[PDB]
Amino acid sequence: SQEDMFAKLKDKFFNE
Amino acid sequence: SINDSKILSLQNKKNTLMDTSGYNAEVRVEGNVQLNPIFPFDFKLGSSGDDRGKVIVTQNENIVYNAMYESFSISFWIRINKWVSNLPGYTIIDSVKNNSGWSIGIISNFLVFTLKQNENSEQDINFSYDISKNAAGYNKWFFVTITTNMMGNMMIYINGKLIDTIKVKELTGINFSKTITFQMNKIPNDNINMWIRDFYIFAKELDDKDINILFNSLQYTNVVKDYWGNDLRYDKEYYMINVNYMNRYMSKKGNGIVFNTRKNNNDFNEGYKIIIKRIRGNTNDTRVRGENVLYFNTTIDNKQYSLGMYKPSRNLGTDLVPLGALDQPMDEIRKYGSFIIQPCNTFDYYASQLFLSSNATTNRLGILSIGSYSFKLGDDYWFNHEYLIPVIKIEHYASLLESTSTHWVFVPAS
16 A cells, blocks of 8 residues: 555655 | 548558548658657758758648638647757748748747738737746757637647637738748858658638647657657656756765766756666556556766665655665565656646655555755765765655656756
8 A cells, every 4th residue: 555655655665 | 520620631551651541732842850759750850051951842722611601720749859958940841932931930938920911011920938838948859739820819839738829910811832842041140950740731720629639649658758758668768857946966975875966957967877678567558658657777986876775874754765766676676666646737837746665566655756864875974964965765755746846857868
């Protein structure tokens, strides 16, 4: 889902 | 139908320039004239040498004027290379005999249409391009439309937009020439090229609506264009620039793509270049089309990188992820470096918007934008530094859709 992809992006590319 | 009043239609057809209006004008071609075998099937002329190109169109003297009364329109696509703002005077399309008829010329940043009744009476109208928006020259394709009513106005349109309107006052009638000459002739007082396609003459005065229907019907609006208006292509080096930052070129520091101020506006040949690579699309013919899924390669110091997201040293802002240059396999490119392209053309530029792809599908996750942010790249240690970077706004980006900071252009490296 989209919500899963946004959560993945937050986890990977944001501090923290 | 607006084609009912079309009395000349100069088109390249199976490697031959001809009139396709049904009025069967004689089309004589001399010297160095090159015909494009592919779209837009244009013809190319130069100012160089004694053997420069010359196209002579001789219209049938009778039949073409039966429907004409007081009004006529001229439309064509044109591109002039190295149209510098200090350009010397050139006559490019001439249709004057015995000081009577019309002429199209270029001088400085002006395209001038002159209408001559006789040696003593004439009127002109012009388009002058914005020098500040075109520092490296006005070298792109544009669509010209000139309408004249002898008992009304002369009007000039560029790209469907009305530029100027002048009341015909001096002139009381025109004896038109049989002949139209396409040739680059310097006015009697460094080398330039000109491309023309679909030169039409109408026996009526076209309105704003007609001109726009015409303007759009001569385009493949689904095909993304480069900065000069030619079809954007895969597997070709381009300088990628943001519309709001034309005086910036691409550079690299650590993982990040950074924008530096360019040396001058001689051309756009500075910094690193991108190559566009196809992942997904309906057609497979090298042309970049709307809704295609793609990624970007770039060669830096004998290594090839792809553009992709990376975690910055500290947060830049809500929903913001920086775009950098990464040496990554295809699986990572699909997850974090794939984009969906959508053309957006304006009067000023041929550009496009890029949306972050969800796993190389047509599902959107964000929009590619640009901004200055204070963080650490490369060997930055003690201090944060302001960097102008390509940045993706994810999830919430509705107020960025109409922003010109999301408009990207591609200038051919050649």
